[PDB]
């Protein structure tokens, strides 16, 4: 009786939200950006190839200096690369080799990683002893760690396969805020440029916008037909793009609270592993299971170019803060640095 | 380069030398993914031979590294394992269909299309006693078991009731029938009849993995 009545009210609220979004869907992003000229053909060459990982690379993250990057592989090795010289700066042996994510702190003093061991390990890069040591192990998730991102030297946000995201205080080792509401495994998260909000994508084909300080879900974005594997904020923080197993990328707007554009092709039938934006946000780079990385025109939904330099799945990619280059990691155990030429 | 850059490159080359030592150990070790249910008794099988529960054992100068897990997202991590050890409990007829449904998911998994399955039909002694008592009938759960006859090519163990042999091969046929449904020979299922107290379980994985490794080569030399 009471349960049946309540679940009927949820359906009414869902229709109310859907009608509200349809009310403000006066135009389409495709119509708005029809007049602007296309970006043309985007040609990028492999400037660097980072060799030394002996297993599938699953994650990479640039440091804020746009020169150092950290990559994680399931050979149990965290490696920090000097991208200009291809020098290996550090090699961090992981206690658990099943790492799925890695993050570089904006200060550059810490890196984080974690996987099927359900632990987020914090590593101190600047010690008087001259070696990288574990500074904190963040326990509390009951599923695998899928993504992690530093807010500062003391705060980090982690998403897990136990359907929850958490905000952690590294100094005390306790999660100050827990973000619940996803009904599937959360596969990725992205921080807003001001680090006041973050979006997370789960396997329930939905993307939720969370307030870091308040600790609740502000908005929920649907439209995908399968698990979301990747998510990335627009450089101004007013939009984000997702990638799912349905071979499509969607551009959601925070303020319009709805999907704006879909990035899919008939030839593309493979899942998407990673997504990122260029510095101006005009380019959307997506990694695919078909061994390729497709560069999309974010405004016009046109495939601007293809990065074909890997012999296995492109598992991750990322663009530097200055926008100079893009790195792609792959299951073939190699990292490549790409940029164009005049 | 400058004076510090040459020292930096020397540090980078000493890291590569340290990675080289780890690569030799990594490639020489075979990694097995152990799957099953709570009642499968997989934890006993690994214990006798000895998040993610990892076990390393060495048989005849060959190092085996077995991962015990207890799922479409984290199963991509085990994409490069040599074999998958799928364990079921044959005695529990009630949940056999769940095992068959679970086995079909793994066999037809997109990320496990080239990974052979060393299927273990655990607790055969319990299955023999359950059939011998006769209280429970497999035909209740599997009606097609009535029209099943033991093939003449069967090789029962000495001193074994023929009724057990008819039932024991029927369960094995159910899993093997799933294996031949699709795949086109890229990977092979390796049915076995083990028990918890069995001491030869390590050898069965050894010989089956040797066949898996050998069949990798014969695909490479025939340009398949």
């Amino acid at each position, epitope marked *: 009786s009471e349960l049946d009545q309540l679940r009927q009210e949820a359906e009414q609220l869902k229709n109310q939200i859907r009608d509200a979004r349809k009310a403000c869907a006066d135009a389409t992003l495709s119509q708005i950006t029809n007049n602007i000229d296309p970006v043309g053909r985007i040609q990028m060459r492999t400037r660097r190839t980072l060799r030394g990982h002996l297993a599938k690379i699953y994650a990479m993250h640039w440091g804020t200096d746009s020169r*150092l990057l950290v990559s994680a592989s399931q050979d149990g090795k965290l490696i920090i690369w000097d991208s200009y010289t291809t020098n290996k700066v550090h090699a961090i042996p992981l206690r658990s080799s099943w790492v799925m994510t890695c993050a570089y702190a904006p200060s550059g003093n810490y890196v984080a990683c974690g996987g099927l061991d359900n632990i987020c390990s914090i590593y101190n890069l*600047k010690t*008087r*002893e*001259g070696n990288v040591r574990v500074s904190r192990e963040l326990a509390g998730h009951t599923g695998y760690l899928s993504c992690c991102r530093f807010l500062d030297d003391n705060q980090i946000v982690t998403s897990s396969g136990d359907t929850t995201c958490a905000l952690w205080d590294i100094e005390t080792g306790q999660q100050t805020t827990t973000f619940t509401g996803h009904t599937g495994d959360v596969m990725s998260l992205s921080l807003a440029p001001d680090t006041r909000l973050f979006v997370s994508g789960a396997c329930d084909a939905s993307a939720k916008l969370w307030d870091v300080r308040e600790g609740m879900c502000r908005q929920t974005f649907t439209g995908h037909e399968s698990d979301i594997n990747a998510i990335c904020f627009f450089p101004n923080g007013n939009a984000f793009a997702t990638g799912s197993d349905d071979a499509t990328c969607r551009l959601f707007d925070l303020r319009a609270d709805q999907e704006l554009m879909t990035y899919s092709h008939d030839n593309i039938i493979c899942g998407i592993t990673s997504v990122s934006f260029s510095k101006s946000g005009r380019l959307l780079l997506a990694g695919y299971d078909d061994f390729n990385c497709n560069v999309w025109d974010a405004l016009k939904a046109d495939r601007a170019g293809v990065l074909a330099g890997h012999d296995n799945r492109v598992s991750c990619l990322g663009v530097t803060d200055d926008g100079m280059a893009v790195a792609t990691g792959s299951w073939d155990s190699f990292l490549k640095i790409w940029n164009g030429s005049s | 380069l*400058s*004076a510090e850059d*040459k020292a930096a490159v*020397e540090r980078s080359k000493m890291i590569e030398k340290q990675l080289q030592k780890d690569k030799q150990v990594y490639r020489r070790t075979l990694r097995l993914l152990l799957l099953g249910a709570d009642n499968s008794g997989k934890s006993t099988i690994v214990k006798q031979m000895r998040g993610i529960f990892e076990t390393k054992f060495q048989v005849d100068k060959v190092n085996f590294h077995m991962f015990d897990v207890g799922r479409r997202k984290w199963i991509q991590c085990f994409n490069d394992v040599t074999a998958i050890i799928f364990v079921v409990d044959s005695s529990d007829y009630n949940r056999l269909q769940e095992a068959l449904n679970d086995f079909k998911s793994i066999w037809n998994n997109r990320w496990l299309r080239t990974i052979s399955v060393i299927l273990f039909l655990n607790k055969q002694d319990l299955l023999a006693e359950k059939v011998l008592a006769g209280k429970s009938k497999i035909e209740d759960y599997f009606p097609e078991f009535a029209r099943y006859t033991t093939p003449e090519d069967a090789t029962p163990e000495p001193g074994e009731d023929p009724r057990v042999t008819r039932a024991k091969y029927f369960i094995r046929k159910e899993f093997v029938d799933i294996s031949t449904a699709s795949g086109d020979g890229r990977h092979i299922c390796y049915p076995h009849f083990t028990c918890s107290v069995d001491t030869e379980n390590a050898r069965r994985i050894f010989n089956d993995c040797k066949d898996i490794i050998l069949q990798m080569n014969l695909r490479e030399y025939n340009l398949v």
Partner: single-chain antibody, 231 residues
């Protein structure tokens, strides 16, 4: 804590041989390159030898090349300096210096206490030998080099050291602008090409000492004469 203790020094006859040891504790010794730097009594610092991490690269100063042998024992975390044909010119305090080299590292960050031995090329110029100073007042120290220390990669390989009376030298500024860990923010390093300035705002009693500018553009590493601050 990070420690570097030297031993083996003492009075030796001219033309003799002596073995200096540097025991390291509290840090990963095998990851650090090691230098020997000596300082003659009432004189400036003089670089002696260098052995890299992994013992793959070894450098010597011209005045000691062929007579001194530098070696390390990574399992024991001990640094050695085998000396032969010792002359009266070798009478100095010998310092054990750790230095690790990667992008953004701080070489020459820690110095040992030193051991005293008594026996019976880019030019770095610090013309101002001494500067009378008062607490709370801003002081500038100038350094010059015969060659441009700016490399094509953008780095300017200039280092600043402070040797308080009775104490081992301490790193202040590495690569001409970066501030070493544990150094107050009042120290600031500014330079361009061949001319460099060290500005010390709000001088304090602890800042009193001799300041040396060292170049790390190429070997052999050379020190400036040194500028002394006195009250």
């Amino acid at each position: 804590d990070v420690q570097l203790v030297e031993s083996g020094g003492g009075l030796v006859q001219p033309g003799g041989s002596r073995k200096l040891s540097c025991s390291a504790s509290g840090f990963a010794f095998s990851s650090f390159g090691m230098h020997w730097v000596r300082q003659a009594p009432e004189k400036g610092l003089e670089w002696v030898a260098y052995i890299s991490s992994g013992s793959g690269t070894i450098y010597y100063a011209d005045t000691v090349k062929g007579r001194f042998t530098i070696s390390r024992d990574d399992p024991k975390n001990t640094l050695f300096l085998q000396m032969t044909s010792l002359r009266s010119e070798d009478t100095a305090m010998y310092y054990c210096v750790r230095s690790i080299y990667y992008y953004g590292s701080s070489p020459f960050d820690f110095w040992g206490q030193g051991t005293t031995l008594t026996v019976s090329d880019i030019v770095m110029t610090q013309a101002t030998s001494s500067v009378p100073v008062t607490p709370g007042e801003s002081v500038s120290i100038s350094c010059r080099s015969s060659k441009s220390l700016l490399h094509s990669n953008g780095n300017t390989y200039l280092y600043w050291f402070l040797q308080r009376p009775g104490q081992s030298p301490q790193l202040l500024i590495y690569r001409m602008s970066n501030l070493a860990s544990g150094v107050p923010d009042r120290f600031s390093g500014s330079g361009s090409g061949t001319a460099f300035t060290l500005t010390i705002s709000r001088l304090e009693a602890e800042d009193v000492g001799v300041y040396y500018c060292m170049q790390h553009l190429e070997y052999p590493l050379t020190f400036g004469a040194g500028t002394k601050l006195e009250l």
